[PDB]
Short mmCIF file of C-alpha atoms and ligand atoms in Angstrom, two decimals:
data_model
loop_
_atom_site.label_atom_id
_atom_site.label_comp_id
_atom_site.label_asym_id
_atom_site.label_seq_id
_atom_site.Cartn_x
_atom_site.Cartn_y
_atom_site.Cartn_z
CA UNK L 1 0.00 0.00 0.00
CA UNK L 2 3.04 2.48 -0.02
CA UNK L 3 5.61 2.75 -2.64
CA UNK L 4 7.74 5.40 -1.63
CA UNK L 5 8.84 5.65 1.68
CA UNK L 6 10.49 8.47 2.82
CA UNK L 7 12.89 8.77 6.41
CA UNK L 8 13.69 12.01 7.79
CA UNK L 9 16.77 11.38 9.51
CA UNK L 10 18.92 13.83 12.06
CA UNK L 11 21.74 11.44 13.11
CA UNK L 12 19.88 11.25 16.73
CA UNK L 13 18.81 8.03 17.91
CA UNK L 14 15.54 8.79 17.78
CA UNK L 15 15.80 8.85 14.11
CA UNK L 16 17.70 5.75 14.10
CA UNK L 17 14.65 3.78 15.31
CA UNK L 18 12.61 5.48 12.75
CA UNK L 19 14.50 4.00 9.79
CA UNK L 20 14.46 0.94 11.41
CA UNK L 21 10.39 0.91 11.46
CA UNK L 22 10.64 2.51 7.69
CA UNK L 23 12.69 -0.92 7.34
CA UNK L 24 9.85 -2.77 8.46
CA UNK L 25 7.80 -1.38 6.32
CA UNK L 26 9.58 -1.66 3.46
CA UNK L 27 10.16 -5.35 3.19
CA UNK L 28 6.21 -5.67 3.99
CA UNK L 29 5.34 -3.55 1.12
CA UNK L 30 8.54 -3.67 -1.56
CA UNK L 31 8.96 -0.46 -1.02
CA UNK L 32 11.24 2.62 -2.27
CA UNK L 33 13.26 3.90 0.94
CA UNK L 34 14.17 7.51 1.02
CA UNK L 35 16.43 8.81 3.25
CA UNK L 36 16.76 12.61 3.42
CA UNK L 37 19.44 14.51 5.74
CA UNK L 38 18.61 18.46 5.94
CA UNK L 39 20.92 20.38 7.45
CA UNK L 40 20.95 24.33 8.01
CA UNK L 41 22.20 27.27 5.70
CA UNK L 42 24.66 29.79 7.45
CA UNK L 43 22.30 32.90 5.98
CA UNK L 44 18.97 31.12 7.79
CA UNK L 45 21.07 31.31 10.91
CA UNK L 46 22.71 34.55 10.98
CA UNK L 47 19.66 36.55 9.49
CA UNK L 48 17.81 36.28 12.20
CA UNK L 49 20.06 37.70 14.83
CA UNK L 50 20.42 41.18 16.25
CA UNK L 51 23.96 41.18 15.94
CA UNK L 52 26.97 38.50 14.29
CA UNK L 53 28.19 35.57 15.80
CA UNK L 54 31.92 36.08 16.60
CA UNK L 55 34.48 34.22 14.81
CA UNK L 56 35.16 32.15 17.64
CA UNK L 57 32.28 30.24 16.87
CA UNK L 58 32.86 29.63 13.00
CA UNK L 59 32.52 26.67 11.09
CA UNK L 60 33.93 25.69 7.63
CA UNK L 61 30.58 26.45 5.21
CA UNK L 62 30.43 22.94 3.97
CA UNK L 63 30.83 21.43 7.50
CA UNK L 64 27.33 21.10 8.04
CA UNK L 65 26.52 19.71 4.47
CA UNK L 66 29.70 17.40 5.02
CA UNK L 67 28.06 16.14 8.19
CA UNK L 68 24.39 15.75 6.81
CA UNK L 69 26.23 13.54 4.08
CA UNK L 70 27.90 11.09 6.88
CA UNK L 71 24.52 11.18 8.97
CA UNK L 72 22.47 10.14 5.33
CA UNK L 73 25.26 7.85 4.15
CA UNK L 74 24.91 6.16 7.41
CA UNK L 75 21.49 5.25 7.32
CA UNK L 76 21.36 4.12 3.78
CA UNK L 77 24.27 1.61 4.88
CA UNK L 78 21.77 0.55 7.93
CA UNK L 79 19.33 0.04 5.69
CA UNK L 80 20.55 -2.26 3.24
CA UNK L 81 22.73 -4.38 5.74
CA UNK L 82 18.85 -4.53 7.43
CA UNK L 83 17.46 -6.04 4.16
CA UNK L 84 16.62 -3.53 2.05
CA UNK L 85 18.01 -4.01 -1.17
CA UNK L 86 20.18 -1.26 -2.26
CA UNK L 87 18.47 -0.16 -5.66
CA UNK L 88 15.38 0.34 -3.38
CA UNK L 89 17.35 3.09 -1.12
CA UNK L 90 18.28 6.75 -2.42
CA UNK L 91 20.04 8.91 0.01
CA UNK L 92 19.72 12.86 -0.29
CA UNK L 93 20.71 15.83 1.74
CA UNK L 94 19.31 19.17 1.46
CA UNK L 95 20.03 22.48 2.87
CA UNK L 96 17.36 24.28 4.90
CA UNK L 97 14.13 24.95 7.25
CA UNK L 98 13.75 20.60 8.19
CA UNK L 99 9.91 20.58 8.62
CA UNK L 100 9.29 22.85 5.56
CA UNK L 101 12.34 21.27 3.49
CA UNK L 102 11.12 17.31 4.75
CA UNK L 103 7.17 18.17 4.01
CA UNK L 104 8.22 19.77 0.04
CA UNK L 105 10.61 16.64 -0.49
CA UNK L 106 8.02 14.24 0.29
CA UNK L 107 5.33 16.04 -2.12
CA UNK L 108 7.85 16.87 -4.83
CA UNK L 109 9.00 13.06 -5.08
CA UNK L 110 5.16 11.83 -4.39
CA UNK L 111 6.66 9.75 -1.37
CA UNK L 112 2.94 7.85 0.01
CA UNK L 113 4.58 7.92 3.73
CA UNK L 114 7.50 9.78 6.12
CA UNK L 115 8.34 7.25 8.78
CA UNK L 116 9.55 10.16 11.71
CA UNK L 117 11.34 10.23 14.93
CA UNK L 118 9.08 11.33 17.89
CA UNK L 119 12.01 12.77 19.09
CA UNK L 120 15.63 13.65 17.57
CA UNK L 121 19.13 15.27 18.85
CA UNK L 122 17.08 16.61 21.54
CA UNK L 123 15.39 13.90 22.72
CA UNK L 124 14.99 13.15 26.59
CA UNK L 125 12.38 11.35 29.07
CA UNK L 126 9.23 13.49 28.25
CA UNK L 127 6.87 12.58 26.33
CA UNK L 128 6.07 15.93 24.19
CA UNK L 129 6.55 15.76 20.11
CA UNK L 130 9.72 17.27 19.06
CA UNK L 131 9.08 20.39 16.80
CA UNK L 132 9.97 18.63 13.66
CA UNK L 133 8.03 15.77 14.01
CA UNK L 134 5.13 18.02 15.02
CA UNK L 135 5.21 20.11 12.68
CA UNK L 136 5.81 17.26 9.73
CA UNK L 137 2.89 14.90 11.06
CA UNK L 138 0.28 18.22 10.56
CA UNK L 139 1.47 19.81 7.12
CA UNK L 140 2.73 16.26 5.12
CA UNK L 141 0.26 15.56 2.34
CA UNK L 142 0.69 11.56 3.22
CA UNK L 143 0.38 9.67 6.48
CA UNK L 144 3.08 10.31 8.50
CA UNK L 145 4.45 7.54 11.50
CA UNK L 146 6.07 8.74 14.73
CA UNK L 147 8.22 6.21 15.97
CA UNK Q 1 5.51 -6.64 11.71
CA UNK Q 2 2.01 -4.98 13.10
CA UNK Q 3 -0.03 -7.93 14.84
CA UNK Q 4 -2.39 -5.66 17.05
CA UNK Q 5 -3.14 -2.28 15.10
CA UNK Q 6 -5.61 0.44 17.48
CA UNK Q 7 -7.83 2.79 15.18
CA UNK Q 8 -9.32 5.87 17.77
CA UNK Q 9 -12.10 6.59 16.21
CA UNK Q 10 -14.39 10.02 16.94
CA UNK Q 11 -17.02 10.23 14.27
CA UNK Q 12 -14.70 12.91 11.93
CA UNK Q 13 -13.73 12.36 8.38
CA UNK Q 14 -9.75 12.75 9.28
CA UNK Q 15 -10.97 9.32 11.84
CA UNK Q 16 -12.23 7.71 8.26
CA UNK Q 17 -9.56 8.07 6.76
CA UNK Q 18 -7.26 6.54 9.67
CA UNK Q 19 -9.81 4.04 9.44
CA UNK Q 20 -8.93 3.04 5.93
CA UNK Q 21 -5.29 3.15 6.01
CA UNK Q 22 -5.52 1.00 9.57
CA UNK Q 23 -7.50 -1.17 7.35
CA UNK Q 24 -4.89 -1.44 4.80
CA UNK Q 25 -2.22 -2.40 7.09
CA UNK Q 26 -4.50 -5.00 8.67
CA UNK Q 27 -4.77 -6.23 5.42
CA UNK Q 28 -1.26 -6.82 4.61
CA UNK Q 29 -0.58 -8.16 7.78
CA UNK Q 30 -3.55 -10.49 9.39
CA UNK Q 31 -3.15 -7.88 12.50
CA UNK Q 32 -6.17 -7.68 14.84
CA UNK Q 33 -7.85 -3.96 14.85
CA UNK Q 34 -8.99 -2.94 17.74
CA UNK Q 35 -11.17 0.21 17.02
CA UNK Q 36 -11.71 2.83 20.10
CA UNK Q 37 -14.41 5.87 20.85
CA UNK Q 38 -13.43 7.73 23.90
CA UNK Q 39 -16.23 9.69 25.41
CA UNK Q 40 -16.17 12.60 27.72
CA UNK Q 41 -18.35 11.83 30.74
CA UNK Q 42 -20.07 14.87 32.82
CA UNK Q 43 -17.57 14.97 35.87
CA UNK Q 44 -15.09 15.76 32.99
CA UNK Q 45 -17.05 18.16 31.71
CA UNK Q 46 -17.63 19.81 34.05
CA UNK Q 47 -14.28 19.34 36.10
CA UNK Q 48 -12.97 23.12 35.35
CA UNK Q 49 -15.45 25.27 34.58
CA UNK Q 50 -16.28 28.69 36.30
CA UNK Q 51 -20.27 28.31 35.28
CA UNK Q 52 -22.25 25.45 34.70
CA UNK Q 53 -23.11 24.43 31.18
CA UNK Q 54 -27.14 25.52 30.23
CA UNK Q 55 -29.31 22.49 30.75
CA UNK Q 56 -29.69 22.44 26.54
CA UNK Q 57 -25.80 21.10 26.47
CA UNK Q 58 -26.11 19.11 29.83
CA UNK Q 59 -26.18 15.57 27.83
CA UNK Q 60 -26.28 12.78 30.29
CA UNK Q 61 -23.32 9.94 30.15
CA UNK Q 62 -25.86 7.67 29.45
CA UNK Q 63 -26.16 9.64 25.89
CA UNK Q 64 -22.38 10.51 25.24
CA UNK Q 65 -21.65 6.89 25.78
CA UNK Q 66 -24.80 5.45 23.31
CA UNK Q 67 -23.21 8.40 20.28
CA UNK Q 68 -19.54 6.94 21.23
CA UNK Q 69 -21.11 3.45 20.65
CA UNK Q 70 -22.71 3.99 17.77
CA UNK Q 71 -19.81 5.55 16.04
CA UNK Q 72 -17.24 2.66 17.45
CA UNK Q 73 -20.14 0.15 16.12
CA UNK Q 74 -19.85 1.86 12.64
CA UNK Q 75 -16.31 1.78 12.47
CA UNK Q 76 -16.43 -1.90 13.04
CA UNK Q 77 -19.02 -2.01 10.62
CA UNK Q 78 -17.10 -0.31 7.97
CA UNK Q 79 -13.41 -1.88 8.63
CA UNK Q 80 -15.27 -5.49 8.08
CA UNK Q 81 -16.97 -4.22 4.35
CA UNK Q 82 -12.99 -3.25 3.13
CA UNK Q 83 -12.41 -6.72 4.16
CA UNK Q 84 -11.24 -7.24 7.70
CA UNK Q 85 -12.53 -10.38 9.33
CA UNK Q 86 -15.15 -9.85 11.77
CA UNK Q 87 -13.49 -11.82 14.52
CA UNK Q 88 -9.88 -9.68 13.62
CA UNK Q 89 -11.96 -6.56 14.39
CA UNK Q 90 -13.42 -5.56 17.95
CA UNK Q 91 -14.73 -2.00 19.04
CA UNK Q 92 -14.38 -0.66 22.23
CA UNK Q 93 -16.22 2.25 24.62
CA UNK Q 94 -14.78 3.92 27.07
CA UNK Q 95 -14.66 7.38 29.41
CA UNK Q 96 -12.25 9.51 30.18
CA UNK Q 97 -9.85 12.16 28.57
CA UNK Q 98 -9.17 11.03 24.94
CA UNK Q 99 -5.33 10.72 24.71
CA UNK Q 100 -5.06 10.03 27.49
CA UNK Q 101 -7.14 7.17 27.45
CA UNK Q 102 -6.42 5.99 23.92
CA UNK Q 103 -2.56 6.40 25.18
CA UNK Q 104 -3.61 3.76 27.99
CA UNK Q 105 -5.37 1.24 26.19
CA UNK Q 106 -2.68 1.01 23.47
CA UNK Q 107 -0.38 0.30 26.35
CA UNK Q 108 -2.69 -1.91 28.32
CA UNK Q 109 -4.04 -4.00 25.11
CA UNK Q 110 -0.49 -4.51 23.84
CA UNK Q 111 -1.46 -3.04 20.41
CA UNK Q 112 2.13 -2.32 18.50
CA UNK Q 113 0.57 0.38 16.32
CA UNK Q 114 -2.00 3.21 16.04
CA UNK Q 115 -3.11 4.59 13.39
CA UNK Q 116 -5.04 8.54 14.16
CA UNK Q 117 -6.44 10.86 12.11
CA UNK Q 118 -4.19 14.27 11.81
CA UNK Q 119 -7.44 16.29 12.31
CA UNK Q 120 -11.07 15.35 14.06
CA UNK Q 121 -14.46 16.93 14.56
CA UNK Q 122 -12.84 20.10 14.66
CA UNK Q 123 -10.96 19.45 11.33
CA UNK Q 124 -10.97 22.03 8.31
CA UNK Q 125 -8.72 23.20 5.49
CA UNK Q 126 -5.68 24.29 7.83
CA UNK Q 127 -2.89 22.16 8.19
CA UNK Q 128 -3.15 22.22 12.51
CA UNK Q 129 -2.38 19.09 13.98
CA UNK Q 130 -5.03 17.89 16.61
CA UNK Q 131 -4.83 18.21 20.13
CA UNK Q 132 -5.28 14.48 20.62
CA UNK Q 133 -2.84 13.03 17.49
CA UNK Q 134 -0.40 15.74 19.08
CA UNK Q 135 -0.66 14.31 22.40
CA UNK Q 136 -1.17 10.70 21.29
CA UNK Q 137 2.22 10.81 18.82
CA UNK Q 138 3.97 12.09 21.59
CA UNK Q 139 3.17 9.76 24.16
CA UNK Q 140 2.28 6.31 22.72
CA UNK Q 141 4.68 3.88 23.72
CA UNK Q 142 4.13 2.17 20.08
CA UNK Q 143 4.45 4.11 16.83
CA UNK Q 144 1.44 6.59 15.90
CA UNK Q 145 0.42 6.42 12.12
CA UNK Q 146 -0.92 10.14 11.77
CA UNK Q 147 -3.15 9.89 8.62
N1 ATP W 1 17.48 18.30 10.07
C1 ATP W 1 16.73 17.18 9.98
N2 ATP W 1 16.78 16.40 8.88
C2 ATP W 1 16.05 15.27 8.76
N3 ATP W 1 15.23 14.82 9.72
C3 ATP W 1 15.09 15.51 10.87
C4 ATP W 1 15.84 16.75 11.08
N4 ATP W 1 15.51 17.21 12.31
C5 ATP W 1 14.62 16.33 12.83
N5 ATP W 1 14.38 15.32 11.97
C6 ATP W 1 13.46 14.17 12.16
O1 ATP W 1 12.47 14.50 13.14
C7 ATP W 1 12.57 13.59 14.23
C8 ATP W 1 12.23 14.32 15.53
O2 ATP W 1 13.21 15.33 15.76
P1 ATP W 1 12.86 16.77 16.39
O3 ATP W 1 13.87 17.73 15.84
O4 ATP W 1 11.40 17.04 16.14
O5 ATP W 1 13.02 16.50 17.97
P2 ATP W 1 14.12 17.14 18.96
O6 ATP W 1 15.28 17.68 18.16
O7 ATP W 1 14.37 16.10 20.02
O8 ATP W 1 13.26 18.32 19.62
P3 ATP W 1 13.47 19.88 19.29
O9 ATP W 1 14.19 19.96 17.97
O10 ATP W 1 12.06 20.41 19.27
O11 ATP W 1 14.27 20.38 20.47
C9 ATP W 1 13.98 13.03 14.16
O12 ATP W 1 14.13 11.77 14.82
C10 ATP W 1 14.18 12.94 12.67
O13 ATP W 1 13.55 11.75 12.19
N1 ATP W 2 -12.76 11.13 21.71
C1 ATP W 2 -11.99 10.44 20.84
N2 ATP W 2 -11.98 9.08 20.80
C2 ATP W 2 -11.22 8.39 19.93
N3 ATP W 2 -10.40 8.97 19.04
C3 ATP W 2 -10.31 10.33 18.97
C4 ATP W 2 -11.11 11.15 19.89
N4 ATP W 2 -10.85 12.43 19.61
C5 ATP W 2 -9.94 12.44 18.61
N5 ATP W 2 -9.62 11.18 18.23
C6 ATP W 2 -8.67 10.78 17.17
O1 ATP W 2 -7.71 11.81 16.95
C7 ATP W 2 -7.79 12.29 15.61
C8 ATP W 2 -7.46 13.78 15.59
O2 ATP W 2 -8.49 14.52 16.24
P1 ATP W 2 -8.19 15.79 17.20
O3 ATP W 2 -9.29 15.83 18.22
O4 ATP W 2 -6.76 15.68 17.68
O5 ATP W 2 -8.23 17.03 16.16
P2 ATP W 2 -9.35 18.18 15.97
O6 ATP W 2 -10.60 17.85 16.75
O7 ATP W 2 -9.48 18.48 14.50
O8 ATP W 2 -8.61 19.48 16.54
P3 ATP W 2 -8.63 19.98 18.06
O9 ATP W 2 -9.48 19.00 18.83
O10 ATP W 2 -7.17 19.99 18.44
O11 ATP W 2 -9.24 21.35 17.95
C9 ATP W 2 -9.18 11.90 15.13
O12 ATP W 2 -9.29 11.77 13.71
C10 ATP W 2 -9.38 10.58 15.84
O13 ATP W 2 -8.74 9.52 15.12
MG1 MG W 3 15.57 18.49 16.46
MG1 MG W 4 -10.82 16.96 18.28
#
């Protein structure tokens, strides 16, 4: 019943055991598996502050992009040593606002479920939604699965 | 993977359409579907409220419980025409605060999925996640299917 199944992941283990369930799903239903990293732009950052963030605290530009790679790299290699074949599992990683950039991939590429993390890098003991997921499971045009 | 799949139902369209894709996975997996109608009874009500409500909207348990029935009863009725076995399907009644209680009985029934609408009675064309999937997502100890 779905044929594209898309996984949000954050390198937290929250989103671990969201792929995991998307792996589930996938041998149940033949599935595609997409895997989709998003990390965030410098600008998106630094535009909305009052004033700059000293140089202290800089980062190489691509560092974030090079780590969304690793983090989306990883979970495609979970995935397939899990059973999923690998010409059933695309990685991506795009740069940007995660709900807003996770909720447009999964329309643009007609994905028929995201498979999310209740909670991600800052997950703890309570029980509340992280803002992602919340956010994802209201605006996704498809069913979306908090694990 | 899904051998005990829980469908809250509360009479909205978003709760048909949970219905359907609950359905679907019971389908492809033999699961049992336990479908659930949580009613609000008067002590609830009525637990924090600065005025009492006008004798007009003071409907007895007796009747929140018989419209919580009949919608539960129609559920059941509707997951067996799509094809779920009659025995595979049971529909359950009860009081209390709705995620809460649906929260609960996921935990207490052993049910390894649940599968909620995004929006209920109060649904429209906004893309607001309900008060219930919020809480439900958030706190189910199994993974939420948020349809
Ligand atoms: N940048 C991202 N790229 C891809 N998926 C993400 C990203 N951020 C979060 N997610 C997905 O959303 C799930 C929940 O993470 P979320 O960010 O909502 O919770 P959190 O970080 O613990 O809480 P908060 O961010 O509200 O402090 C993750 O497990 C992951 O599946
Ligand atoms: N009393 C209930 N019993 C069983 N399931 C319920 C109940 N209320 C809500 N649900 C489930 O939760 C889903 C989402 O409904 P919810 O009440 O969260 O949203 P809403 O009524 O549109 O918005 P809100 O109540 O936040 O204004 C429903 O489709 C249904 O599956
Ligand atoms: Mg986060
Ligand atoms: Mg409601």
């Amino acid at each position: 019943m779905f044929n594209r199944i898309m996984v949000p992941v954050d390198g937290s283990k929250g989103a671990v055991k969201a792929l995991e369930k998307g792996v589930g799903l996938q041998q149940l239903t033949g599935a595609e598996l997409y895997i989709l990293c998003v990390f965030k732009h410098h600008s998106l950052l630094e535009a909305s502050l009052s004033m700059a963030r000293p140089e202290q605290l800089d980062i190489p530009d691509d560092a974030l992009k090079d780590y969304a790679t690793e983090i989306a790299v990883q979970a495609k290699t979970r995935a397939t040593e899990l059973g999923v074949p690998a010409d059933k599992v695309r990685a991506f990683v795009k740069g940007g606002r995660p709900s807003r950039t996770i909720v447009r991939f999964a329309r643009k590429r007609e994905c028929d479920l995201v498979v999310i993390g209740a909670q991600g890098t800052n997950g703890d003991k309570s029980l509340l939604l992280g803002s992602v997921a919340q956010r994802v499971a209201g605006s996704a045009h498809c069913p979306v699965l908090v694990v």
